[PDB]
Each structure stands twice: as C-alpha cells, then as structure tokens.
C-alpha cells in the first residue's frame, strides 16, 4: 500500500474499483485482500484548501460512489470476505453518508445516487433485516437525512421525504405510504419521523438554522411534506400565538414611551417619589420599562449561547436578535446611569427608545406582503452601506482635510463644521455664501465644485443605483423568505413556549405496515396530506 | 353508497367510470343501477380551503 501522507491507505482492491476492473477486484476479494482498509490519505479526506476525492475511506463506499452495483453485490455478499455494510469511516461516515455528500442536484447525479442509495437500503434489508443503516450518525451527529439537509442537497431529500418502495419484504423503510387515489386527488401518509421531533437534530432545525451558504436554504422548504407541516403549524397554534406577542410588545413600547416622555426634569437621579398619581404609575412604567430590557437581554444570551455563531456570519445571519440585544444593553446602561447619579442616562435611555420602535419591523417579517420591507432593509445596510462607507469617507476625509489646510480663520477652519457641511452638500443641504474676505477665494470654490460634483452628483447616484439593484433583485424573491420567516419563527415558537408542554404532534400513532422484518409492528407518527396533479 | 360527509353518495357506477372501466359500467346498467344518483360530499362539492374533485 501507499504510506505517503497524501495517497495513506490507497491498496490494489482501491485501485481495481476506481479503474471499473471487476475480474481483479474478484481476484483479489479470493486471493484474500481486506475489503475493510481504510484510504485515510489527505487526498482521500474531506477537505477544502486542496483538491481531492473524498469517497468514505473504504472500497464499498468507493464502489457506490462510483455506481458500480455489482462490485458491491459481491462485497457484501461474496463468501472469502463479506462486506460490513454498516462500517464507519473517520469521520463517521457510512456509505450513505459517502452517498449523499457526493451528491450536487445535477440529473445525473440525482439518478444513479438515489438508485445506489436505494439499492444499498435493499440489500441491507434483505443481509441484515434488524440493521437500521439511517438512523447510524457520523462524528458530527448527522444521520443521511440530516448531512443532506444540512448541505443543501435537494435531490437526496425529495428521494427520501416521499419514498415509497412497491417490493414486499421491504416496505417497512418506506416513508410515503399511499391510501387512495382518485381523478385528480390523492391521499397519502407520510412518515414524519425526525422531522418534528429527534431529540438530536431534526431536519427543521437544520434547515432552518443553517449558516445562509446553503445553496438551496429556501427550496428545501417547498418540499411537501414540509410546506404542509409548516402550514399545519402555523394554523393551527402558532399563528395566535405570534400576534399574541406582538400585542404585548406593541403595549411594552407605548408604556416605555409614555414613561420616557414624562421623565423629570430636576438634577441628579434618582428622584424622589411623590404621594401622587403621577409619581406612582410614572415608577410603574419606569419599572415594565427596565423588566423588559432584562428580559430581552436574556434572551440574547441564551441564543447566543445555544447557536454559537462565529463571526464572519454574526451579521449575516442574526440580525435581529443583535438589534434586540443592542436594544436591551442601551436600557441596561440606561438604568446604571440613573442609579449612578448622572443625568447621561436620558441620552442613552432616547437612543434604546428609537430602537425600541425601529425593532418592531422584526413583526413585518411573516406577512408575504410586509416581510419584504425589513430584509431590504437588512440587506441595504449590511451590503451596500457598509462597503460604500469607505469610499464615501475617503473622499470626505481628503476634501475636509484639503479645505480644512486652506482657510485661515473662518468659519470653516474646523474639523467639525467642515465635515459637517460637506455631509450636508453630499445630500444637498448647502449653503454656498461666497461672501467672504479670505484670499485663495478661487481654490477654494473650485475645491468645493469638484467636491460636490464628486460626491452629490456621482458618488450618490451609483450608490442609488446598487441599492436599486438589491430592491429589484429580492422583490421577486419574496415568496419563498416569507416562507422561511415563517419556518424560524414556527421552530422558535416550539422551542421555548415557557409552558414545558411538547403536544407538538401532528395527526394520529398510526400503523403503517404492521410486519416488520420480527413480530412487531411500527407505530410512527404519520402525517396525512392529500394532493392534487391535472396530468393527463 | 358512502354514507360519511366526505364522500355521500358516491357508489360503484362512479368508481367503475373513474377507473375507465366500460365492462364494469355496462354491467352496472345492465344490473340495475342509478344513472342519476348524486354524489354530493364534501370531496366531491366546490370549496376553496379543501382539495377535491369536483
Ligand atoms: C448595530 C447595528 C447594526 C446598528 C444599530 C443602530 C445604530 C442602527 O444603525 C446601524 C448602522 C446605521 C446607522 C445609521 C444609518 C444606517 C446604518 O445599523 C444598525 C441599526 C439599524 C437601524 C435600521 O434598521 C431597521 O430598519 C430596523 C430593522 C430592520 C429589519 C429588521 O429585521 C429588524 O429587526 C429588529 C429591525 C435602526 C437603528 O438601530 C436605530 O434605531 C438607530 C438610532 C440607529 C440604527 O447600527
Ligand atoms: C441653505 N441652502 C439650502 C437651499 O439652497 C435649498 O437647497 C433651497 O433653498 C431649497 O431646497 C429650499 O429652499
């Protein structure tokens, strides 16, 4: 065998399987060769900062990856070394975990894939009736269904969702079980199992908090049974419970508002109450006002803590929860600096306020009509702003500087008003009084020209034109984020519920089959969805 | 016949005609069955908020 550091592992059965040399392979396999090694080479690994070919480490993996069915016919079943069809790679990996990661939603792909995959369930069946391959999870906790779920491969999830295998014997790894069929309509059961409720890591979730660079994030929830799932969920419970809790957040930000507005106006906090009215529901405003903020705070925390984002994706996705926490954290300060004897705490309690307002947008986000406004928000600002802000603060610095060295005790020979004026020449707010008794007059009026041609008529208008760009890119978009808005919201809803009760599920214990492969029958939870096709 | 709400009167003249089963249907005629029974469930009525066929 090789014992490089990049080919570690390779051996000749490797080798008679990748070339499509069935006669070697069964040579070898008789000659006594180990059909279990493991091509464990930096090559032969999951990686991204060198080309490779990851297959699962393991010459049945690479025969199924390779779609070569009767190579693995006569591993598993050949009688000189027989296969384990359940071996786990490095990293965990089954051959089904190999299966779907070298999957890529092209035709192909998605035909031999899912007829490798199905063919290998077939046979694991029939060699090893109580062996259950999918429920097997890698190093990172993944079973088949989640790795494709978390990769965004489309073609492996609507294979596995809805698959039904007309075969006896072998019914009992079916997903989709029919009950009628009539005209147009049908009626089918789906299996459901691990979708709402795994105690590991369901496919909702996984979808659902995914990192954003899953290419297909939003198609994956046009699949049936999950688009039904979520439609379901949202009539049935969740959609009160949403506009339940806008309600109350719309009477937490009227009450911090009045409570902000008639604040005291005398010196040092804290103030003394009065035996009055005022006084009384004055402190009691105050007191929601800062029980809200903790309670946003917390909130933060324990999101924080229970997704770990890293950074380079904590403004990607995450957005909002930021905004809230922001929000919090300026009350939090609010209230130190009030019991800290300082009048500064009004200027933070205004900025928490406006926020306070500003954050209720986050309810648009659901509604297929207003959800739109607050993602082209959220885009412009973290897109287009912020990377025009560079440009935009050169050109300011290097005019505001230049004008700055120019004038000699004016009004202008300052930092402050200068880069003031110029902001508001940028948005056409000028004031433009040559009136004046300096010399150099004529460079300055010619710095001024450029530095308005510059940047009211040229800069601004490009950067209107790419935010154009991102508003008539995602208006089309918006029938599937309202989906996904609403598929977060749903599982955030489930989630915490501040209740411990779970009556999450969805339609009836039903039996399926009632012949497993022993005595028992399967129980699993079956969801119920009748469907609609005009064809022929 | 179906008597439940879904599927109220439907009986085999218009499963046979469903199927695309001539022999079934001219058996059924010939043995005496209702050309002209309603099948007015709720599967089978217009609706908006419900799959059927109407
Ligand atoms: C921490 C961040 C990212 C942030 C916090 C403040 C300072 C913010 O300005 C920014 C930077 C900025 C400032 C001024 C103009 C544009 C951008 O963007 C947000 C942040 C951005 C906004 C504007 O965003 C919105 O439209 C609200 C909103 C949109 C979409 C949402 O999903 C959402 O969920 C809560 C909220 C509101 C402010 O928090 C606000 O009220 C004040 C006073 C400034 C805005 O800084
Ligand atoms: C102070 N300079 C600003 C004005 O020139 C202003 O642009 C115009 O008068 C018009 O927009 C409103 O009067």
């Known amino acids: 065998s090789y014992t490089d550091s990049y080919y570690k592992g390779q051996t000749a059965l490797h080798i008679a399987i990748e070339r499509r040399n069935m006669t070697l392979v069964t040579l070898l396999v008789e000659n006594g060769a180990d059909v279990q090694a493991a091509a464990n080479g930096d090559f032969f690994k999951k990686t991204k900062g060198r080309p490779g070919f990851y297959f699962g480490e393991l010459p049945l993996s690479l025969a199924a990856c390779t779609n ?6 006569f591993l598993l079943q050949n009688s000189w070394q027989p296969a384990d069809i359940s071996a786990r790679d490095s990293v965990g990996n089954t051959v089904l975990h190999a299966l779907v990661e070298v999957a890529d939603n092209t035709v192909d792909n998605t035909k031999f894939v899912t007829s490798m995959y199905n063919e290998i369930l077939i046979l694991g069946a029939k060699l090893h009736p109580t062996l259950k391959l999918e429920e097997i999870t890698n190093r990172k906790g993944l079973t088949p269904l989640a790795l494709a779920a978390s990769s965004g491969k489309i073609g492996v999830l609507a294979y596995i969702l809805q698959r039904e295998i007309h075969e006896p014997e072998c019914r009992h790894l079916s997903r989709k079980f029919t009950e009628w069929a009539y005209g147009p309509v049908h009626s089918s059961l789906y299996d459901l ?18 990192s954003s660079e899953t290419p297909n994030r939003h198609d994956m929830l046009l699949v049936e049974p999950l688009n039904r799932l979520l439609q379901d969920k949202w009539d049935r419970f969740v959609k009160r419970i949403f506009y339940f809790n806008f309600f109350v957040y719309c009477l937490y930000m009227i009450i911090f508002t009045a409570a902000a507005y008639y604040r005291p106006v005398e010196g040092l906090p804290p103030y003394k109450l009065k035996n009055t009215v005022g006084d009384y529901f004055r402190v009691t405003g105050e007191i929601l006002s800062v029980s809200g903020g903790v309670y946003f705070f917390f ?42 004897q300082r009048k500064e705490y009004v200027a933070s309690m205004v900025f928490s306020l406006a926020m306070g307002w500003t954050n209720m947008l986050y309810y648009t986000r659901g509604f297929q009509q207003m959800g739109i406004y607050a993602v082209m928000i959220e885009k ?38 200068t880069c003031l004026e110029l902001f508001k020449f940028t948005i056409g707010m000028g004031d433009l009084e040559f009136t004046e008794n300096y010399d150099f007059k004529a460079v300055f009026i010619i710095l001024l020209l450029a530095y308005v041609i510059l940047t009211y008529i040229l800069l601004l208008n490009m950067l209107i034109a790419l935010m154009g760009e991102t508003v008539n890119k995602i208006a089309q978009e918006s029938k599937n984020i309202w989906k996904l808005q609403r598929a977060i919201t749903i599982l955030d809803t489930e989630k915490s519920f501040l209740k411990c009760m779970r009556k999450a599920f969805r339609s009836g214990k039903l039996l399926q089959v009632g012949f497993t492969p022993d005595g028992k029958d399967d129980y699993r939870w079956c969801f119920r969805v009748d469907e609609v096709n005009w064809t022929t």
């Open 68 to 73: 070569q069915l009767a190579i693995v016919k």
């Open 380 to 417: 412009m600002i973290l897109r287009d702003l912020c990377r025009f802000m560079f440009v935009y603060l050169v050109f300011l610095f290097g005019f505001s500087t230049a004008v700055v060295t120019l004038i000699e005790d004016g009004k202008y020979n300052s930092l402050y008003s």
């Open 193 to 210: 199992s691990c979708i709402d409720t795994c105690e590991k890591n369901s496919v909702l979730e996984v979808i659902a908090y995914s």
């Open 299 to 340: 909130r933060g925390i324990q999101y924080f803590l229970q997704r770990r984002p890293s950074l380079k994706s904590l403004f990607v996705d995450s957005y909002s929860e930021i905004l809230f926490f922001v929000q919090s954290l300026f009350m939090l300060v609010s209230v130190v600096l009030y019991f800290s």
